[PDB]
C-alpha cells in the first residue's frame, strides 16, 4: 500500500482550538512541519499518509 515514515525532531507546541492538536517537526534529508493529534514524542517515527505541503500553525 501507500505510506511514508518521518522521524520526529522537535515537538513545537500544542495547537488548535481545544489544545488537542500538536505542531511537530519531522525529518524525511528533508525537514517537514506537520500537525499531529494524540500524545507524541521526539526521536520516534510518525507515519505520513500524504507527505506534502508543510504546515502552518493552528
Amino acid at each position: 500500500e501507500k505510506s511514508k515514515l518521518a522521524k520526529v525532531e522537535k515537538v513545537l507546541g500544542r495547537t488548535g482550538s481545544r489544545g488537542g492538536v500538536i505542531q511537530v517537526r519531522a525529518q524525511f534529508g528533508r525537514f517537514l512541519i506537520r500537525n499531529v493529534k494524540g500524545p507524541v514524542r521526539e526521536g520516534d517515527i510518525l507515519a505520513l499518509l500524504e507527505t506534502e505541503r508543510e504546515a502552518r500553525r493552528l
Binding site: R30, F31, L32, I33, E54
Partner: protein, 95 residues
C-alpha cells in the same frame, strides 16, 4: 479630556492633506493620520525556498521580494492587531 495633542497626525503648518483609502476595506484616512506598514516580505516559505533553490537554473538565486507599503485605518488596525490601546503615559512614546 482631549486625547490627542497633535490630532493623531502631522497637523502642524498645514490645512488639507490628501486621504488615502485603507488596504483592508477602502476606508478614507488622511496620509498624515494613516497607519503605514512597509512589509518587505518574500513569497517563499522555508521549504519552498529550499525546493526553488534545488529546482533552479543557476546556483545564483535572486530571491523574489514583495514590496507592499500597506496602509490601515484605525478601526482595521486595532481589529487586526497592528496596534494596541497602550496606556495614557505610553501614548506619547516613539520607540
Amino acid at each position: 479630556p482631549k486625547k490627542r495633542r497633535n490630532g493623531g497626525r502631522s497637523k502642524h503648518n498645514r490645512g488639507h492633506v490628501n486621504p488615502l483609502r485603507c488596504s483592508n476595506c477602502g476606508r478614507c484616512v488622511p496620509k498624515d493620520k494613516a497607519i503605514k506598514r512597509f512589509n518587505i516580505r518574500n513569497i517563499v516559505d522555508t521549504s519552498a525556498q529550499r525546493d526553488i533553490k534545488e529546482a533552479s537554473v543557476y546556483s545564483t538565486f535572486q530571491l523574489p521580494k514583495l514590496y507592499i507599503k500597506q496602509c490601515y485605518c484605525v478601526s482595521c488596525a486595532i481589529h487586526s492587531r497592528f496596534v494596541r490601546v497602550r496606556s495614557r503615559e505610553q501614548r506619547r512614546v516613539r520607540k
